Design a protein around this motif. Structure first.
Motif, PDB file in Angstrom:
ATOM      1  N   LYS A  19      39.631  50.455  32.674  1.00  6.83           N
ATOM      2  CA  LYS A  19      38.630  51.436  32.267  1.00  6.83           C
ATOM      3  C   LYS A  19      37.417  50.751  31.651  1.00  6.83           C
ATOM      4  CE  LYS A  19      41.315  55.673  31.394  1.00  6.83           C
ATOM      5  NZ  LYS A  19      41.930  56.531  30.340  1.00  6.83           N
ATOM      6  N   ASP A  20      37.654  49.893  30.656  1.00  7.88           N
ATOM      7  CA  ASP A  20      36.574  49.279  29.891  1.00  7.88           C
ATOM      8  C   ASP A  20      35.714  48.335  30.729  1.00  7.88           C
ATOM      9  OD1 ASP A  20      38.305  46.645  29.604  1.00  7.88           O
ATOM     10  OD2 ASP A  20      39.537  48.280  28.815  1.00  7.88           O
ATOM     11  N   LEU A  21      36.307  47.643  31.705  1.00  9.36           N
ATOM     12  CA  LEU A  21      35.605  46.603  32.461  1.00  9.36           C
ATOM     13  C   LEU A  21      34.517  47.235  33.329  1.00  9.36           C
ATOM     14  CD1 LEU A  21      38.846  44.704  33.500  1.00  9.36           C
ATOM     15  CD2 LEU A  21      37.178  43.827  31.844  1.00  9.36           C
ATOM     16  N   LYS A  22      33.409  47.598  32.684  1.00  5.85           N
ATOM     17  CA  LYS A  22      32.255  48.168  33.369  1.00  5.85           C
ATOM     18  C   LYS A  22      31.161  47.150  33.664  1.00  5.85           C
ATOM     19  CE  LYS A  22      32.682  52.885  31.524  1.00  5.85           C
ATOM     20  NZ  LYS A  22      32.734  53.765  32.728  1.00  5.85           N
ATOM     21  N   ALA A  23      31.267  45.935  33.127  1.00  5.49           N
ATOM     22  CA  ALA A  23      30.201  44.949  33.264  1.00  5.49           C
ATOM     23  C   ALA A  23      29.942  44.606  34.728  1.00  5.49           C
ATOM     24  CB  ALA A  23      30.558  43.686  32.478  1.00  5.49           C
ATOM     25  N   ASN A  24      28.678  44.743  35.140  1.00  4.40           N
ATOM     26  CA  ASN A  24      28.194  44.382  36.475  1.00  4.40           C
ATOM     27  C   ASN A  24      28.973  45.115  37.574  1.00  4.40           C
ATOM     28  OD1 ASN A  24      26.192  42.698  35.449  1.00  4.40           O
ATOM     29  ND2 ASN A  24      26.711  40.992  36.820  1.00  4.40           N
ATOM     30  N   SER A  25      28.753  46.432  37.607  1.00  3.30           N
ATOM     31  CA  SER A  25      29.284  47.318  38.647  1.00  3.30           C
ATOM     32  C   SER A  25      30.778  47.092  38.889  1.00  3.30           C
ATOM     33  CB  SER A  25      28.493  47.164  39.949  1.00  3.30           C
ATOM     34  OG  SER A  25      28.674  45.877  40.513  1.00  3.30           O
ATOM     35  N   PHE A  26      31.536  46.971  37.797  1.00  5.16           N
ATOM     36  CA  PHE A  26      32.995  46.848  37.842  1.00  5.16           C
ATOM     37  C   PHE A  26      33.442  45.654  38.686  1.00  5.16           C
ATOM     38  CE2 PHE A  26      31.897  51.263  37.139  1.00  5.16           C
ATOM     39  CZ  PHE A  26      32.713  51.644  36.083  1.00  5.16           C
ATOM     40  N   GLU A  27      32.885  44.477  38.393  1.00 12.43           N
ATOM     41  CA  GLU A  27      33.256  43.297  39.168  1.00 12.43           C
ATOM     42  C   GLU A  27      34.614  42.760  38.738  1.00 12.43           C
ATOM     43  OE1 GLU A  27      31.507  39.077  39.344  1.00 12.43           O
ATOM     44  OE2 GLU A  27      30.124  40.189  40.637  1.00 12.43           O
ATOM     45  N   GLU A  28      34.836  42.627  37.429  1.00 10.56           N
ATOM     46  CA  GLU A  28      36.119  42.124  36.949  1.00 10.56           C
ATOM     47  C   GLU A  28      37.243  43.102  37.255  1.00 10.56           C
ATOM     48  OE1 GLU A  28      36.055  38.944  33.505  1.00 10.56           O
ATOM     49  OE2 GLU A  28      35.480  40.919  32.729  1.00 10.56           O
ATOM     50  N   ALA A  29      37.006  44.397  37.034  1.00  3.41           N
ATOM     51  CA  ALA A  29      38.035  45.394  37.308  1.00  3.41           C
ATOM     52  C   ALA A  29      38.386  45.430  38.789  1.00  3.41           C
ATOM     53  CB  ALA A  29      37.570  46.768  36.827  1.00  3.41           C
ATOM     54  N   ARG A  30      37.390  45.239  39.655  1.00  6.19           N
ATOM     55  CA  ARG A  30      37.649  45.199  41.090  1.00  6.19           C
ATOM     56  C   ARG A  30      38.503  43.993  41.461  1.00  6.19           C
ATOM     57  NH1 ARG A  30      32.471  44.509  44.789  1.00  6.19           N
ATOM     58  NH2 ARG A  30      31.891  46.567  43.952  1.00  6.19           N
ATOM     59  N   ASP A  31      38.198  42.828  40.887  1.00  2.00           N
ATOM     60  CA  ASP A  31      38.929  41.614  41.231  1.00  2.00           C
ATOM     61  C   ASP A  31      40.353  41.636  40.690  1.00  2.00           C
ATOM     62  OD1 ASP A  31      36.533  40.963  42.363  1.00  2.00           O
ATOM     63  OD2 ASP A  31      36.178  39.161  41.168  1.00  2.00           O
ATOM     64  N   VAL A  32      40.547  42.118  39.460  1.00  2.00           N
ATOM     65  CA  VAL A  32      41.891  42.108  38.885  1.00  2.00           C
ATOM     66  C   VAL A  32      42.779  43.152  39.553  1.00  2.00           C
ATOM     67  CG1 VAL A  32      41.079  41.173  36.698  1.00  2.00           C
ATOM     68  CG2 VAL A  32      41.208  43.631  37.028  1.00  2.00           C
ATOM     69  N   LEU A  33      42.189  44.207  40.117  1.00  2.00           N
ATOM     70  CA  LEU A  33      42.982  45.197  40.842  1.00  2.00           C
ATOM     71  C   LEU A  33      43.594  44.593  42.095  1.00  2.00           C
ATOM     72  CD1 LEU A  33      43.707  48.356  41.020  1.00  2.00           C
ATOM     73  CD2 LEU A  33      41.816  48.403  42.662  1.00  2.00           C
ATOM     74  N   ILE A  34      42.787  43.871  42.876  1.00  2.00           N
ATOM     75  CA  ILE A  34      43.292  43.198  44.068  1.00  2.00           C
ATOM     76  C   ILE A  34      44.323  42.150  43.681  1.00  2.00           C
ATOM     77  CG2 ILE A  34      42.640  41.879  46.101  1.00  2.00           C
ATOM     78  CD1 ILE A  34      39.719  43.129  45.448  1.00  2.00           C
ATOM     79  N   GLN A  35      44.098  41.477  42.550  1.00  2.00           N
ATOM     80  CA  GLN A  35      45.061  40.503  42.046  1.00  2.00           C
ATOM     81  C   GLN A  35      46.403  41.161  41.743  1.00  2.00           C
ATOM     82  OE1 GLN A  35      46.392  38.697  38.240  1.00  2.00           O
ATOM     83  NE2 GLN A  35      44.187  38.270  38.186  1.00  2.00           N
ATOM     84  N   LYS A  36      46.384  42.368  41.181  1.00  2.00           N
ATOM     85  CA  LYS A  36      47.630  43.084  40.943  1.00  2.00           C
ATOM     86  C   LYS A  36      48.202  43.668  42.227  1.00  2.00           C
ATOM     87  CE  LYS A  36      47.441  41.987  36.775  1.00  2.00           C
ATOM     88  NZ  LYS A  36      48.338  40.868  36.386  1.00  2.00           N
ATOM     89  N   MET A  37      47.340  44.050  43.176  1.00  2.08           N
ATOM     90  CA  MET A  37      47.819  44.537  44.464  1.00  2.08           C
ATOM     91  C   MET A  37      48.402  43.410  45.305  1.00  2.08           C
ATOM     92  SD  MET A  37      47.547  47.382  43.651  1.00  2.08           S
ATOM     93  CE  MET A  37      48.586  48.107  44.908  1.00  2.08           C
ATOM     94  N   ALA A  38      47.962  42.172  45.068  1.00  6.21           N
ATOM     95  CA  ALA A  38      48.569  41.027  45.736  1.00  6.21           C
ATOM     96  C   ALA A  38      49.948  40.723  45.171  1.00  6.21           C
ATOM     97  CB  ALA A  38      47.662  39.803  45.606  1.00  6.21           C
ATOM     98  N   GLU A  39      50.131  40.917  43.869  1.00  9.97           N
ATOM     99  CA  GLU A  39      51.451  40.754  43.277  1.00  9.97           C
ATOM    100  C   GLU A  39      52.414  41.804  43.816  1.00  9.97           C
ATOM    101  OE1 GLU A  39      51.058  40.705  39.012  1.00  9.97           O
ATOM    102  OE2 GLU A  39      49.568  39.088  39.077  1.00  9.97           O
ATOM    103  N   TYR A  40      51.930  43.038  43.978  1.00  4.99           N
ATOM    104  CA  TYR A  40      52.755  44.125  44.495  1.00  4.99           C
ATOM    105  C   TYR A  40      53.142  43.874  45.947  1.00  4.99           C
ATOM    106  CZ  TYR A  40      53.813  48.925  46.098  1.00  4.99           C
ATOM    107  OH  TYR A  40      54.394  50.040  46.658  1.00  4.99           O
ATOM    108  N   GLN A  41      52.198  43.378  46.750  1.00  6.44           N
ATOM    109  CA  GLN A  41      52.453  43.133  48.168  1.00  6.44           C
ATOM    110  C   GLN A  41      53.475  42.020  48.370  1.00  6.44           C
ATOM    111  OE1 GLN A  41      49.894  43.068  52.268  1.00  6.44           O
ATOM    112  NE2 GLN A  41      48.874  42.442  50.376  1.00  6.44           N
ATOM    113  N   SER A  42      53.333  40.915  47.633  1.00  6.33           N
ATOM    114  CA  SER A  42      54.243  39.787  47.804  1.00  6.33           C
ATOM    115  C   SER A  42      55.648  40.120  47.314  1.00  6.33           C
ATOM    116  CB  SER A  42      53.699  38.564  47.071  1.00  6.33           C
ATOM    117  OG  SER A  42      52.439  38.188  47.589  1.00  6.33           O
ATOM    118  N   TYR A  43      55.753  40.914  46.247  1.00  4.16           N
ATOM    119  CA  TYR A  43      57.060  41.264  45.696  1.00  4.16           C
ATOM    120  C   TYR A  43      57.786  42.252  46.597  1.00  4.16           C
ATOM    121  CZ  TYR A  43      60.537  42.275  42.045  1.00  4.16           C
ATOM    122  OH  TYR A  43      61.702  42.408  41.323  1.00  4.16           O
ATOM    123  N   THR A  44      57.199  43.435  46.789  1.00  2.16           N
ATOM    124  CA  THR A  44      57.869  44.486  47.551  1.00  2.16           C
ATOM    125  C   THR A  44      57.922  44.160  49.038  1.00  2.16           C
ATOM    126  OG1 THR A  44      55.823  45.740  47.830  1.00  2.16           O
ATOM    127  CG2 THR A  44      57.114  46.150  45.851  1.00  2.16           C
TER     128      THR A  44
END
Length: 159
Positions: A19-44
């Protein structure tokens, strides 16, 4: 369970960690989401397709909508083109406006709380397994198969 269509910015606005990661059009929030979606993909093992509304990719399909297209429209195009007899599609979204569409294309809705809970559960189970490796081959390979490619090099660097 096989394919998971994620509403990118719906996850960012709903998860307290993004929610908070609004800096520069949600760049960090966008990157960390894919990072968590990569953890989900490799595990499941399930395939993850994250869809972002137009305003990096560690083996995760990231789709950016068109100029005159929304994320609701893209996940519908994907759900119809991927719905087959063998696979089952899951749409990770909490948008109420989208809730009246999942059933129409043979998909099963997943709330943003459920996807956040699963990612935390996955990390919690990796947390448990990595702790057993550091305290000490047959079990080390099993934990390696559930980890992402980038995380495998980091865990090996720690040991």
């Amino acid at each position: 369970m096989d394919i998971l269509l994620v509403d990118g910015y719906n996850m960012i606005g709903a998860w307290p960690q993004l929610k908070d990661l609004k800096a520069n059009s949600f760049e960090e929030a966008r990157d960390v989401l894919i990072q968590k979606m990569a953890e989900y993909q490799s595990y499941t093992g399930n395939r993850v397709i994250v869809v972002f509304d137009a305003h990096t990719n560690h083996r995760v399909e990231v789709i950016f909508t068109k100029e005159n297209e929304t994320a609701d429209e893209r996940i519908e195009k994907l759900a119809q083109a991927l719905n087959n007899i063998a696979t089952q599609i899951h749409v990770a979204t909490s948008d109420y406006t989208e809730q009246w569409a999942i059933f129409g294309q043979g998909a099963l809705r997943k709330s943003a709380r459920e996807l956040l809970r699963e990612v935390e559960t996955i990390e919690r189970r990796i947390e448990r397994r990595v702790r057993k490796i550091t305290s000490e081959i047959a079990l080390s390979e099993e934990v390696l198969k559930t980890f992402e490619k980038l995380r495998r090099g980091d865990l090996d660097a720690a040991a």
